[PDB]
Design an enzyme around this catalytic site. Structure first.
Site, mmCIF file in Angstrom:
data_model
loop_
_atom_site.group_PDB
_atom_site.id
_atom_site.type_symbol
_atom_site.label_atom_id
_atom_site.label_comp_id
_atom_site.label_asym_id
_atom_site.label_seq_id
_atom_site.Cartn_x
_atom_site.Cartn_y
_atom_site.Cartn_z
ATOM 1 N N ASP A 1 0.685 -1.060 0.088
ATOM 2 C CA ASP A 1 0.026 -0.040 -0.125
ATOM 3 C C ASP A 1 0.805 1.292 -0.089
ATOM 4 O OD1 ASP A 1 -2.175 1.562 -0.473
ATOM 5 O OD2 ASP A 1 -3.551 0.605 1.176
ATOM 6 N N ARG B 1 -0.911 8.964 1.162
ATOM 7 C CA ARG B 1 -1.510 8.646 2.420
ATOM 8 C C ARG B 1 -0.745 7.772 3.649
ATOM 9 N NH1 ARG B 1 -3.890 5.530 -1.385
ATOM 10 N NH2 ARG B 1 -3.980 3.347 -0.845
ATOM 11 N N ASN B 2 0.127 6.956 3.029
ATOM 12 C CA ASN B 2 0.988 6.026 3.742
ATOM 13 C C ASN B 2 2.176 6.516 4.162
ATOM 14 O OD1 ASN B 2 -0.903 3.911 4.778
ATOM 15 N ND2 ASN B 2 -0.987 3.500 2.779
ATOM 16 N N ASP C 1 5.938 1.265 7.154
ATOM 17 C CA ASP C 1 6.012 -0.179 6.790
ATOM 18 C C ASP C 1 4.753 -0.882 6.500
ATOM 19 O OD1 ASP C 1 8.459 -0.605 9.598
ATOM 20 O OD2 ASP C 1 8.901 0.237 7.406
#
Ligand SMILES: COc1cc(Nc2ncc(F)c(Nc3ccc4c(n3)NC(=O)C(C)(C)O4)n2)cc(OC)c1OC
Length: 262
Positions: A125, A129-130, A143
Site C-alpha cells: 500500500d 496517504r501512507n 512499513d
C-alpha cells in the site's frame, strides 16, 4: 518477551491526540522526557506486524521505538513525524514547493523502497496517504498502512471497497498478481501524487472506470511541474508487462541522475 523492545509505560507522557478510529488511537507524546514519539494504542495480528517492524530499520522508514505488551490496551511507540501525512502536506499551498523539494521527496521514498526490496519485503500500500514527513521535510514510509488498527480491520484495510485501485497495476486488478513489480507501479503513482501536489490519481474517474481504463493502457498524464526526464521515470513504472518495469535500485539511480541534471 520482546526483550529490549519492551517499553515501560511509566516513561511516557501523553500530550495531543493525532487520530482516532473504531479500532485504535494515536497520540503524540514524550518518552523519558526527551524524545518525541507517536503512541499507537489498540490484537494478535497487530503484534505480528510489530515483530515485522522490529526486523526493518532504515533512515527513510518510520522507526519502531518499542512496545508495551503487559497492560491492556497494548501500545506501539514509533518515531514522531512533526509535519504529519505526506498527502496532506502536499496539499498545503502555503509550502510553495519547488520542484527540487518534490524530487527529494521522491528520492526519500525511493531509498525506503530499495531497502524493502533488498529485504524481499513487499509493501502493498505504498501511497502518499501512507507516508509521513518529519520536522525537517524529510519523507519516510510507514512499513504498514497508517489506517491499520485505527480506522479499519486487518480484514478491512485493503479489502474490497477499501482496496488501493488507483495505486495498482493491471495484473493486480484483474488477477490478484502481487510481486515487487506492483510496488514499482505504485511508487510511480505516488511520484505522480507528489508532482501534482496531492491530486487524486485519475481524479475524474471512479475505481471501476480507473480499472477499465488502466486495462486499456490508459496512463496518468505528466503533471505540469514534472519535467520530461522526471515523467519518463514514473512512466517507466507503468509498463503493462511487469518484468519490463525497473527495480528500485535502477529508479533511485535514475532519480539521482535527474537531480544532478536539473
Ligand atoms: C502533527 O499532526 C500529525 C502528525 C502525525 N505524526 C505521526 N508521526 C508518527 C506516527 F506513527 C503517526 N501515526 C499516526 C498518526 C495519526 C493517525 C494514524 N497514525 N493512523 C490513522 O489511522 C489516522 C490517520 C486516523 O491517525 N503520526 C501524523 C498525522 O496524521 C497522520 C498528523 O496529522 C493529524
Amino acid at each position: 518477551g520482546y526483550g529490549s523492545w519492551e517499553i515501560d509505560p511509566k516513561d511516557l507522557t501523553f500530550l495531543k491526540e493525532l487520530g482516532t478510529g473504531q479500532f485504535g488511537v494515536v497520540k503524540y507524546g514524550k518518552w523519558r522526557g526527551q524524545y518525541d514519539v507517536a503512541i499507537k494504542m489498540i490484537e494478535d495480528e497487530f503484534i505480528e506486524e510489530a515483530k515485522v517492524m522490529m526486523n526493518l530499520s532504515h533512515e527513510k522508514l518510520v522507526q519502531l521505538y518499542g512496545v508495551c505488551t503487559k497492560q491492556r490496551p497494548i501500545f506501539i511507540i514509533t518515531e514522531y513525524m512533526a509535519n504529519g501525512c505526506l498527502l496532506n502536506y502536499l496539499r498545503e499551498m502555503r509550502h510553495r514547493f519547488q520542484t527540487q523539494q518534490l524530487l527529494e521527496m521522491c528520492k526519500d521514498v525511493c531509498e525506503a523502497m530499495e531497502y524493502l526490496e533488498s529485504k524481499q519485503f513487499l509493501h502493498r500500500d505504498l501511497a502518499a496517504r501512507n507516508c509521513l514527513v518529519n520536522d525537517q521535510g524529510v519523507v519516510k514510509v510507514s512499513d504498514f498502512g497508517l489506517s491499520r488498527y485505527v480506522l479499519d480491520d486487518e480484514y478491512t484495510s485493503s479489502v474490497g471497497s477499501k482496496f488501493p485501485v488507483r495505486w495498482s497495476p493491471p495484473e493486480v486488478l484483474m488477477y490478484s498478481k502481487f510481486s515487487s513489480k506492483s510496488d514499482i507501479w505504485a511508487f510511480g503513482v505516488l511520484m505522480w501524487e507528489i508532482y501534482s501536489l496531492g491530486k487524486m490519481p485519475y481524479e475524474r474517474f471512479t475505481n471501476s472506470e480507473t480499472a477499465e481504463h488502466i486495462a486499456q493502457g490508459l496512463r496518468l498524464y505528466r503533471p505540469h511541474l514534472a519535467s520530461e526526464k522526471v515523467y519518463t521515470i514514473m512512466y517507466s513504472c507503468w509498463h503493462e508487462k511487469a518484468d519490463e518495469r525497473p527495480t528500485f535500485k535502477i529508479l533511485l539511480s535514475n532519480i539521482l541522475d535527474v537531480m544532478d541534471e536539473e
